[PDB]
Amino acid sequence: EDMAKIYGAVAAVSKNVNSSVTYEVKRGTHELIKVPTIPHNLVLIQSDNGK
Amino acid sequence: GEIIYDGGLSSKLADVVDKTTEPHNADGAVKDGRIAPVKLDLEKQKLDKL
């Protein structure tokens, strides 16, 4: 019985080993919007007689 | 005539999980005694908790 306790404690220590890490790489990334129209900013000014 | 062979249950070699799976260690025939991969909340954009 006391041997099972000693053997169990050793197995607990051996099981404390770490395997790996996992993380997401998202820094520096931004979403993109879509502009549907082109701004021209033009107006045609014409006289009444058209000259 | 009498039928000897007409087919049957066919064994498939691979089971291809058609869905995204989070990282995991060995389970099944080989069981991994090491700790599971640690999920770290890194590369935050807005600065929280600092």
From TrEMBL, chain B:
| Coiled-coil regions listed | none
Report the superkingdom from the record: Viruses
Give the protein name, as stated in the record: Vp2
Source organism:
Banna virus
**Whole protein: which stretch is covered?**
52 to 101 of 955
